Amino acid sequence: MNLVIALHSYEPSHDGDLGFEKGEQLRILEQSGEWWKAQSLTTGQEGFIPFNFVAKANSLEPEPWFFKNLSRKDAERQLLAPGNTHGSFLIRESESTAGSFSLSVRDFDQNQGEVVKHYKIRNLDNGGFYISPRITFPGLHELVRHYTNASDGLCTRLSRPCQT
Amino acid sequence: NLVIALHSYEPSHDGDLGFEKGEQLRILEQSGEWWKAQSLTTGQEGFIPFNFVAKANSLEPEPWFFKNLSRKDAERQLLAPGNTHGSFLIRESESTAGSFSLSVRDFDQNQGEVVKHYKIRNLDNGGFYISPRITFPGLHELVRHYTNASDGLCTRLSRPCQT
Amino acid sequence: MNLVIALHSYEPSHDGDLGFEKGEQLRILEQSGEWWKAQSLTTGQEGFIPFNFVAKANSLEPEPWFFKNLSRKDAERQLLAPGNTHGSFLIRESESTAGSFSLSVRDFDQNQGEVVKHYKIRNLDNGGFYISPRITFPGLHELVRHYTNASDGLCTRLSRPCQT
Amino acid sequence: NLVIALHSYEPSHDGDLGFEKGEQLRILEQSGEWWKAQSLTTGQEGFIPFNFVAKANSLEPEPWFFKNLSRKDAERQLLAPGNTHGSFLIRESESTAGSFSLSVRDFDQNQGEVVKHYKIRNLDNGGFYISPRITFPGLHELVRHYTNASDGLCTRLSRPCQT
Amino acid sequence: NLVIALHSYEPSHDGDLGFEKGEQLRILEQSGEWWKAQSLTTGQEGFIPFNFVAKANSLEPEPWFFKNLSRKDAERQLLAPGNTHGSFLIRESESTAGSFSLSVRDFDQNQGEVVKHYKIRNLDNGGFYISPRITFPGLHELVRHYTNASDGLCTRLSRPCQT
Amino acid sequence: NLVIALHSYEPSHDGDLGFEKGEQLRILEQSGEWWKAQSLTTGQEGFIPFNFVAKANSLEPEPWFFKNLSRKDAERQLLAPGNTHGSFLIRESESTAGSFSLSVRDFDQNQGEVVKHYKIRNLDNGGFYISPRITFPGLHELVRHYTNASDGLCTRLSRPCQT
Amino acid sequence: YDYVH
Amino acid sequence: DYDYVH
Amino acid sequence: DYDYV
Amino acid sequence: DYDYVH
Amino acid sequence: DYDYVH
Amino acid sequence: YDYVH
Ligand code: NA
Ligand code: NA
Ligand code: NA
Ligand code: NA
Ligand code: NA
Ligand code: NA
């Protein structure tokens, strides 16, 4: 199931739209670019919702790129191990700070070969996240989505979750 | 889910998954540019470049696809309550028994809402295009592209027609 | 830009940065693209801040394009008055739906020539705004700034404020 | 906020303020591509195309400009506390006559925080450029461009050096 | 393939071909950003930045430049068969001496096949422009821009009028 | 300029020239997206869509191609005076019979002038690619692309090697 | 009122 | 008739 | 008469 | 320490 | 040995 | 020095 949380309240603008309130949970039926087909878990009603009005509610543990109990050195150890290449990344709990997370990704370099950059995922008041103040995110899911299709700020794109 | 290899691919980086042209693969993860796939002939896993394959999944399921559907029928379905600007659907061309048409609802000043039709031409290899500007290996790619851009069309493909 | 309100709390990450907590009031000294030089009204320490983290705090009344006490007709006519052209716009507070704002912009219809299209500016929960759920803004300034540089969705960019 | 008219401009749209090349104007409102200005010559007010003018303001006040600053002091003054990746400044070229040099602090893998230098060549009609790719009517326009995009430089000009 | 230098260029990258303003050059290769060229003043050849020169060849030879053509005759030729939306031409203006006009055929959702005319304003020192937002050194550059991008025109310049 | 058809194109616009996959055409004009071509099969003339065809000319003449050129010669050549950052060339691969290699001069901070080598892979029904992110019908198209944009290369192919 | 596109 | 792209 | 940008 | 928006 | 795309 | 990288 594709669960999402309403970040804001939405009043139906166009016919076929599904209205909802901030905090409300919904399930995603269809992904159509900016508009998504959703079903309210409250009333079972369906309709289209503006994709940027919600955030993935699914737990992070099941994510292919999340590794809760992983140390900074371990990340380097696995990221640099064979079976991975430039672009490989993972998200782990921050070591230097609690309640936070760190982004680890393998990159190349003309000087030294494959390397491992670590980016601190800073927390936000409303609970949000961000690596660079240029772009903020409601959740780690969204953050990963963004940098998997664009690297604005990073040496490389989050090409693929670390492999064992 | 299911994708067909449009070209052969020899593993280049670690964790890559090689495959012969015209091979059936099963997608496991869609990490943007590199997908986690599994061959239906080797059972071996790995990552593949998304543009070397195309959705092989039947069309019948597709929300925007409507095989048995007349041209005037599309205009009604599209103009009826529940739909709006950018609502679209792909039917099986009324004229030609084999082609497909893209039907999309938009607005106008001379008259209110309106339904535009677009002939989806074919490619010798089996691809599709509406504008010779961009071609596609299948209708999925085509709908995927026009929903993220009005590259030539009158209006971005907002959402699939609603019954 | 004279005064802004921190939309989020920011911790000094670079040597020369000015930290600040959400809601804090800051005064802009110099704009350097993405890093603005600010002065905390509270502490009074000069520093560099990320613009994405703040929103114009100054009154709307002085804004060239704002016309609070203006009806739809009054706005619809003023725009058609001489001194204005396609792309001329303004924002007023809907007398009807108080607390809500509206955007009026002149455009040319190759069928009905000069015309004035109106767009509602929906309110967001956190206190933000938006015309299209696709893009949201923390204040009307951000919105205008946005639509005068790109008409994504609008019939035309907000070229020039209405003139008397 | 004074500008000099690079070209003459006849009013095309209603509300436009026409002017001749060389005239100075005061910028009132910066509405994206069409700015609101007042002729310092006639006192008249109107909208003008932003790309037809250039900042006439002095170079002294500018936070990023330092008249008589050696190249060694630029490197020292730059790697000093209060400045980081993206800090920059412009000073007169100590190696070339009548020219300017751009100094910005960057970062290298095996070198750490370093200080790169770019020379600003002079254009025949008085403009400037770091890269023949893009030219500018003035230094202000040049700084503005690069602080808003690493269009060639290793980094966007983030913050003007701090004393 | 004969260009003229708008600015002077001092060799920077080993291999550059330096040149003075107004100098004549013949272009040998168009490697995107840099063009291999040859000086008709020193005979020496090399690479030059393309935005520092402008096509100086004659206009008549251009496929889209029909000098003696009337505002009305253009509408007659453009709407003639063998042409479509995006077809265009430039003619010696008949509403302003020493001027040129841009005529292009677009499609209207009301009148049907229509033809629009854009006044090509002349700039202070031999330049040209339809929109103050973008200016060009010559009609050649102007067309090149609008064929590769309908930046302002609700229609892109696809093909020159076909007699 | 000779070209071959990669797909078949059926006319939908006036002045459009239709053709069949594999048909050779002669390019007369180059209007950005649409090119005026002449059939070698029929002799008919009209506008064709540029991405439906690819250069049919021989590679020998190309300024960036060089048959009998060893990897060392290429390096020794690219490092020779009169070349800089972005100077490049394509030779036959020493490590892969039937393949080509892209050699390009770049600049590092620790060893300055360097020469990078990229393997150019082949595709099934013809085609080449350096990155599975972008494929190309032929080397011409490949070079055209990486000269106007370097997505992966440590530099844009600015100018072919000079002897 | 009009809408976004 | 189709409202083909332009 | 004439059309604009 | 960490890396950043290079 | 060769190099590769980012 | 350093040229437009
Ligand atoms: Na996991
Ligand atoms: Na269906
Ligand atoms: Na006001
Ligand atoms: Na100063
Ligand atoms: Na001619
Ligand atoms: Na050759």
Side-chain angles (χ1 to χ4, degrees):
Chain A
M1 185 178 231
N2 327 57
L3 206 69
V4 301
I5 316 291
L7 286 169
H8 303 132
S9 301
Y10 184 61
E11 276 284 12
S13 290
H14 323 78
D15 217 333
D17 269 18
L18 171 61
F20 54 84
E21 298 189 304
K22 175 175 184 307
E24 171 164 1
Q25 288 184 305
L26 309 168
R27 46 174 310 217
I28 308 305
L29 308 188
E30 287 149 42
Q31 164 198 183
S32 181
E34 298 185 292
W35 292 87
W36 288 357
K37 189 70 172 305
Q39 180 189 287
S40 181
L41 305 187
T42 306
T43 81
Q45 166 174 33
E46 282 178 40
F48 289 95
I49 67 172
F51 123 84
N52 69 310
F53 260 50
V54 300
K56 205 100 301 176
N58 298 291
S59 193
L60 288 172
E61 278 63 22
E63 283 298 294
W65 43 259
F66 189 61
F67 295 85
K68 195 174 188 302
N69 297 157
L70 197 74
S71 70
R72 168 158 186 148
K73 59 155 287 296
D74 263 324
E76 298 176 352
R77 199 108 97 193
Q78 311 293 275
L79 279 173
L80 285 162
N84 289 309
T85 180
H86 43 102
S88 286
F89 72 108
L90 60 86
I91 299 279
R92 38 172 256 254
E93 284 167 332
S94 190
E95 285 207 344
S96 58
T97 309
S100 290
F101 309 88
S102 295
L103 175 67
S104 284
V105 42
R106 187 208 281 201
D107 189 45
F108 205 82
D109 201 286
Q110 202 210 83
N111 305 308
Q112 296 295 66
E114 326 281 7
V115 293
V116 171
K117 298 283 225 285
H118 296 291
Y119 298 98
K120 223 279 198 163
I121 299 171
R122 325 199 71 207
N123 282 72
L124 223 51
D125 291 285
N126 56 46
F129 295 105
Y130 80 89
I131 282 183
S132 162
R134 286 192 303 190
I135 333 103
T136 59
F137 300 90
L140 293 183
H141 276 267
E142 290 61 25
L143 172 155
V144 180
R145 187 194 296 159
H146 176 68
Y147 296 103
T148 30
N149 309 83
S151 82
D152 60 299
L154 312 189
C155 315
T156 186
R157 297 185 166 72
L158 309 189
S159 309
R160 30 180 132 170
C162 189
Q163 304 294 294
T164 49
Chain B
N1 177 72
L2 221 79
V3 295
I4 185 87
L6 295 180
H7 291 139
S8 293
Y9 177 65
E10 197 274 301
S12 175
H13 318 68
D14 272 42
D16 273 16
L17 169 58
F19 51 91
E20 177 177 54
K21 183 207 198 79
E23 197 169 313
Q24 207 84 33
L25 279 51
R26 166 144 299 164
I27 305 305
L28 307 173
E29 303 174 51
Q30 285 177 171
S31 203
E33 211 150 67
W34 290 80
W35 296 353
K36 190 67 179 302
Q38 200 211 67
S39 193
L40 304 186
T41 336
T42 77
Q44 202 84 203
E45 288 177 47
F47 296 102
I48 65 176
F50 80 94
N51 57 305
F52 263 57
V53 302
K55 257 53 193 61
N57 289 296
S58 183
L59 288 192
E60 188 177 305
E62 288 307 330
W64 39 264
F65 190 61
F66 294 104
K67 206 176 184 185
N68 327 308
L69 198 64
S70 151
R71 162 159 169 156
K72 286 292 184 305
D73 283 343
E75 289 173 333
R76 275 139 66 193
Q77 207 73 28
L78 283 173
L79 285 166
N83 290 307
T84 48
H85 320 66
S87 277
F88 66 107
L89 68 85
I90 293 177
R91 47 130 188 306
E92 201 263 26
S93 202
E94 82 192 320
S95 64
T96 321
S99 279
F100 300 98
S101 302
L102 166 61
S103 297
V104 59
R105 190 222 276 207
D106 198 40
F107 208 67
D108 173 51
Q109 63 252 309
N110 288 64
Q111 195 197 60
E113 294 269 45
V114 290
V115 179
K116 298 189 188 302
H117 298 287
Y118 291 96
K119 184 83 190 67
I120 299 172
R121 315 192 173 288
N122 301 70
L123 242 56
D124 311 285
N125 60 44
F128 298 94
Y129 73 95
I130 298 177
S131 178
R133 172 194 280 91
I134 334 98
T135 56
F136 304 95
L139 292 187
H140 292 285
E141 291 72 14
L142 187 156
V143 179
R144 182 196 294 152
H145 172 74
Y146 286 114
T147 47
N148 300 174
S150 183
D151 206 35
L153 289 174
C154 156
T155 293
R156 173 211 233 53
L157 290 193
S158 285
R159 21 186 144 162
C161 191
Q162 295 305 297
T163 43
Chain C
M1 202 71 87
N2 195 65
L3 202 74
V4 295
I5 313 176
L7 297 163
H8 297 116
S9 300
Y10 177 66
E11 174 178 49
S13 17
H14 306 143
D15 188 21
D17 277 319
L18 163 56
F20 53 83
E21 313 188 286
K22 163 141 60 193
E24 199 176 323
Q25 203 116 305
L26 285 163
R27 201 185 204 288
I28 304 301
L29 304 182
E30 284 154 21
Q31 293 174 174
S32 193
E34 302 181 317
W35 287 103
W36 293 351
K37 167 71 75 58
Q39 172 170 57
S40 176
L41 299 189
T42 307
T43 75
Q45 182 212 304
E46 291 175 281
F48 277 105
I49 64 174
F51 93 103
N52 310 278
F53 271 55
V54 295
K56 181 158 177 177
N58 288 58
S59 173
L60 288 169
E61 316 185 318
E63 293 299 27
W65 42 259
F66 193 57
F67 295 106
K68 172 147 293 183
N69 304 146
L70 207 79
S71 78
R72 178 164 168 139
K73 72 177 270 294
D74 286 330
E76 227 166 10
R77 222 186 304 189
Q78 236 82 64
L79 283 167
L80 297 177
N84 299 302
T85 191
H86 315 138
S88 293
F89 76 100
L90 65 73
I91 292 181
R92 44 176 219 281
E93 182 162 42
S94 301
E95 303 186 2
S96 53
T97 314
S100 198
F101 294 102
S102 285
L103 171 86
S104 299
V105 61
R106 197 219 278 195
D107 191 55
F108 178 94
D109 190 358
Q110 190 159 55
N111 215 60
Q112 288 269 57
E114 253 71 7
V115 300
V116 171
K117 297 184 177 63
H118 300 262
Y119 303 95
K120 269 297 285 51
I121 305 167
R122 277 141 155 284
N123 292 307
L124 213 50
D125 308 81
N126 55 15
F129 292 100
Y130 77 88
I131 284 183
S132 171
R134 318 193 293 94
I135 336 94
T136 83
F137 307 93
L140 290 182
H141 311 269
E142 288 59 34
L143 176 148
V144 177
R145 176 207 284 163
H146 178 85
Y147 291 109
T148 56
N149 294 137
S151 73
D152 49 317
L154 297 184
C155 289
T156 300
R157 293 182 184 66
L158 303 180
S159 181
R160 301 125 75 128
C162 176
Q163 308 295 273
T164 328
Chain D
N1 279 297
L2 305 192
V3 297
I4 301 173
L6 299 177
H7 302 132
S8 285
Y9 175 64
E10 184 195 16
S12 293
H13 302 128
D14 197 31
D16 274 6
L17 168 78
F19 53 86
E20 288 78 58
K21 172 161 169 294
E23 191 171 329
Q24 295 172 215
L25 316 136
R26 179 165 95 91
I27 307 302
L28 312 179
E29 308 162 346
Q30 285 169 295
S31 184
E33 272 166 331
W34 284 95
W35 292 352
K36 185 65 185 302
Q38 166 174 286
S39 164
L40 291 205
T41 303
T42 48
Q44 229 73 287
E45 280 171 44
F47 283 99
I48 65 172
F50 97 87
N51 84 324
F52 266 51
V53 297
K55 253 62 190 190
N57 297 46
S58 303
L59 284 178
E60 324 311 311
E62 307 314 299
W64 44 267
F65 172 78
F66 289 122
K67 191 165 87 174
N68 314 317
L69 177 71
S70 73
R71 170 186 172 119
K72 62 168 182 171
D73 268 70
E75 294 182 350
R76 283 143 50 200
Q77 191 67 57
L78 259 174
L79 300 178
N83 302 295
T84 56
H85 303 165
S87 300
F88 74 111
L89 60 86
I90 291 169
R91 51 148 211 284
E92 285 148 44
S93 182
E94 70 159 24
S95 62
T96 307
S99 299
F100 296 94
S101 305
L102 166 66
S103 298
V104 58
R105 189 211 280 189
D106 210 314
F107 167 94
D108 190 72
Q109 300 295 64
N110 65 301
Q111 299 182 58
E113 295 199 306
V114 295
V115 175
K116 291 174 172 292
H117 298 288
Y118 297 82
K119 52 200 295 200
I120 306 163
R121 302 200 180 262
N122 295 317
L123 220 49
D124 275 324
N125 47 39
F128 299 93
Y129 73 87
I130 266 74
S131 160
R133 201 188 316 163
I134 338 82
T135 62
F136 307 100
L139 277 189
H140 300 273
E141 283 69 26
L142 176 153
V143 176
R144 184 199 291 161
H145 176 73
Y146 291 102
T147 63
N148 290 101
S150 176
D151 192 350
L153 311 176
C154 301
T155 61
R156 290 168 166 71
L157 303 184
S158 305
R159 336 178 179 193
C161 190
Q162 302 283 288
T163 59
Chain E
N1 64 315
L2 176 69
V3 295
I4 181 163
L6 306 157
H7 296 129
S8 294
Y9 187 61
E10 180 178 71
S12 52
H13 310 134
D14 180 359
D16 285 0
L17 173 75
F19 54 78
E20 306 189 320
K21 186 164 184 181
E23 175 161 0
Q24 300 282 287
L25 292 162
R26 50 135 61 167
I27 305 298
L28 296 167
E29 264 161 51
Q30 279 182 171
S31 192
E33 180 182 358
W34 296 88
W35 296 353
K36 175 96 166 297
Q38 200 204 168
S39 173
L40 307 192
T41 299
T42 76
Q44 296 158 303
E45 54 188 286
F47 286 101
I48 61 151
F50 85 112
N51 61 303
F52 272 45
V53 304
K55 289 170 281 150
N57 277 51
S58 181
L59 271 191
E60 286 83 17
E62 282 312 308
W64 41 262
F65 185 76
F66 298 89
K67 187 162 183 180
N68 312 318
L69 206 63
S70 49
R71 173 188 173 82
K72 25 277 290 301
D73 266 48
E75 285 178 333
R76 258 66 180 201
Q77 283 295 292
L78 284 170
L79 303 166
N83 272 139
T84 46
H85 354 79
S87 283
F88 73 99
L89 65 90
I90 296 180
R91 49 126 184 303
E92 187 105 51
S93 178
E94 62 174 48
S95 172
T96 317
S99 277
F100 293 112
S101 280
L102 172 51
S103 289
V104 68
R105 181 215 282 193
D106 179 43
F107 200 113
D108 189 51
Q109 334 294 63
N110 169 60
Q111 164 60 202
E113 289 69 78
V114 200
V115 165
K116 300 179 176 180
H117 301 253
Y118 299 78
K119 215 298 101 53
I120 301 180
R121 311 179 191 299
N122 315 314
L123 209 48
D124 236 296
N125 257 292
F128 291 102
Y129 80 80
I130 301 188
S131 179
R133 317 197 309 176
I134 333 91
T135 57
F136 313 99
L139 295 186
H140 297 243
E141 285 64 17
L142 186 152
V143 172
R144 184 206 303 167
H145 176 77
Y146 295 93
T147 56
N148 287 82
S150 57
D151 165 47
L153 312 174
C154 295
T155 322
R156 189 160 162 177
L157 306 199
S158 303
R159 331 143 152 69
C161 188
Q162 287 292 304
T163 72
Chain F
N1 275 284
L2 274 49
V3 297
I4 290 186
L6 306 161
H7 303 141
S8 289
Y9 178 60
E10 274 193 310
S12 295
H13 289 36
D14 244 316
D16 251 15
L17 168 62
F19 51 84
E20 212 99 79
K21 177 164 193 173
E23 202 191 318
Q24 290 185 304
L25 310 178
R26 168 189 169 185
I27 308 308
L28 304 184
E29 283 155 40
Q30 290 212 180
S31 199
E33 176 181 355
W34 292 90
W35 295 354
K36 179 68 159 302
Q38 177 187 279
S39 167
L40 299 183
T41 295
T42 83
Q44 300 280 303
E45 257 166 38
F47 286 105
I48 64 169
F50 112 98
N51 59 308
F52 274 57
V53 300
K55 268 59 188 61
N57 303 321
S58 45
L59 286 174
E60 290 293 8
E62 280 316 330
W64 45 260
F65 186 69
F66 293 106
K67 277 226 171 183
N68 329 308
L69 191 61
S70 76
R71 170 169 180 133
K72 185 138 98 187
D73 292 332
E75 296 190 56
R76 189 91 66 167
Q77 209 78 187
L78 283 167
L79 289 162
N83 296 352
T84 29
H85 323 143
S87 276
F88 67 102
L89 60 85
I90 293 187
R91 42 167 227 263
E92 266 130 36
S93 187
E94 283 176 359
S95 309
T96 321
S99 294
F100 297 102
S101 307
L102 177 64
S103 292
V104 36
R105 198 220 266 202
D106 182 60
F107 185 90
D108 168 53
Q109 349 296 290
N110 315 172
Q111 52 208 306
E113 256 51 55
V114 285
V115 170
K116 307 198 181 307
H117 296 260
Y118 302 87
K119 219 292 150 298
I120 296 174
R121 303 191 180 298
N122 303 301
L123 225 56
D124 301 302
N125 183 58
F128 305 91
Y129 75 87
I130 285 180
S131 180
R133 162 170 56 185
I134 343 85
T135 43
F136 299 107
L139 304 174
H140 299 282
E141 293 61 38
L142 185 154
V143 174
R144 183 195 303 159
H145 171 73
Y146 286 105
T147 60
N148 289 77
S150 65
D151 44 68
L153 300 181
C154 299
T155 27
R156 259 132 210 167
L157 313 188
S158 64
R159 42 172 96 171
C161 187
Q162 226 57 209
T163 82
Chain G
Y1 292 110
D2 312 62
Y3 282 92
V4 63
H5 290 178
Chain H
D1 172 287
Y2 285 75
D3 197 285
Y4 224 43
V5 59
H6 78 71
Chain I
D1 53 3
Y2 280 57
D3 307 56
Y4 285 64
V5 300
Chain J
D1 212 7
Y2 293 80
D3 309 297
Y4 229 76
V5 182
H6 293 300
Chain K
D1 198 1
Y2 299 61
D3 301 55
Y4 249 154
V5 158
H6 315 308
Chain L
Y1 273 148
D2 300 289
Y3 225 83
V4 53
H5 300 295

